[PDB]
Amino acid sequence: SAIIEAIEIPQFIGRSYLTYDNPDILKRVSGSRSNVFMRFKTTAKDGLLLWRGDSPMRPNSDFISLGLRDGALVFSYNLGSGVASIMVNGSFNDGRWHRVKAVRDGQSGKITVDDYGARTGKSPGMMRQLNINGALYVGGMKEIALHTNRQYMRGLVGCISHFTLSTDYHISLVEDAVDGKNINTCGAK
Ligand SMILES: *[C@@H]1O[C@H](CO)[C@@H](O)[C@H](O)[C@H]1NC(C)=O
């Protein structure tokens, strides 16, 4: 027989998310340095890919975020003195896989999608450190509008195949999550 075995790729339907509270994971979403890699695909123009902020979310709370806006990828973060928002202008909601690398050291941030030209930006003020107490969310989150200060209204509609932090620290999306909502295999349903 031709039965294949493989590692599940999670699918998100807008009200879906995976949550991580593993200290070994959260410790890499904190401090002055951040390195996020993701491979994803979607047909929806908007959607949250990654988020970690404060709970309860306050107006000037720290956060780091990755998401889609009208097909464009937006890397955003607040370190305590203002938000950086760095966009790679594209139409990545074409239902094909795209890889995004988002890198930050202190205030300075950089995001590269596929082989398109990288875009850079900088958080204002003097704050250089991510000081966040919430769990790490992928593909969406519970009460997304409240917890992101209305920066995102829906989670991802699509799939996420790869998620790496610190260039080298692979996250097993399904197995490493402490919880999930409305998650199924990519392509099923
Ligand atoms: C992004 O691309 C669109 C084309 O779809 C263009 O109209 C728009 O001006 C671009 N944005 C920037 C900031 O160049």
Side-chain angles (χ1 to χ4, degrees):
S1 69
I3 293 163
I4 285 305
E5 309 209 62
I7 301 299
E8 170 180 1
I9 290 176
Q11 179 174 296
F12 307 83
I13 61 175
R15 62 185 303 248
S16 312
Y17 56 84
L18 289 162
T19 322
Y20 308 84
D21 64 359
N22 189 333
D24 275 337
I25 299 178
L26 303 179
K27 70 161 51 191
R28 288 165 172 91
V29 188
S30 174
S32 65
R33 182 183 306 278
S34 296
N35 195 317
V36 172
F37 173 87
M38 267 178 161
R39 181 177 284 99
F40 74 95
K41 74 188 226 299
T42 179
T43 41
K45 65 179 190 178
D46 301 329
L48 180 64
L49 284 173
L50 180 150
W51 174 277
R52 197 187 178 203
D54 286 339
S55 187
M57 188 69 177
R58 287 161 192 171
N60 203 24
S61 287
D62 296 17
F63 74 88
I64 184 165
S65 82
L66 193 63
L68 294 142
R69 182 192 309 178
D70 266 298
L73 266 162
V74 182
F75 177 34
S76 197
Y77 50 90
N78 188 4
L79 310 179
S81 54
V83 173
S85 181
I86 318 166
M87 173 174 296
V88 173
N89 198 16
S91 298
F92 309 114
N93 56 321
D94 60 356
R96 300 194 65 180
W97 295 105
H98 300 284
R99 66 190 191 281
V100 53
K101 219 172 189 176
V103 176
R104 180 195 60 92
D105 192 19
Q107 298 100 322
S108 302
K110 182 174 172 194
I111 176 178
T112 313
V113 186
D114 295 340
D115 290 308
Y116 304 109
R119 290 293 174 265
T120 58
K122 185 172 297 184
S123 169
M126 291 277 85
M127 301 281 208
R128 307 166 303 185
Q129 304 257 356
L130 257 186
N131 184 26
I132 45 194
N133 53 43
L136 176 69
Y137 291 86
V138 164
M141 67 184 315
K142 177 184 178 62
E143 304 174 331
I144 184 172
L146 168 61
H147 284 103
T148 69
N149 291 333
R150 298 122 309 181
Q151 201 193 143
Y152 292 92
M153 315 305 187
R154 294 194 68 187
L156 180 75
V157 183
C159 306
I160 298 175
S161 60
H162 295 83
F163 175 29
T164 303
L165 296 167
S166 309
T167 305
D168 260 343
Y169 197 80
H170 301 303
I171 302 303
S172 299
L173 284 154
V174 169
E175 300 186 22
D176 286 339
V178 70
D179 202 14
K181 184 182 175 192
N182 298 136
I183 304 293
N184 51 47
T185 309
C186 186
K189 204 78 142 308

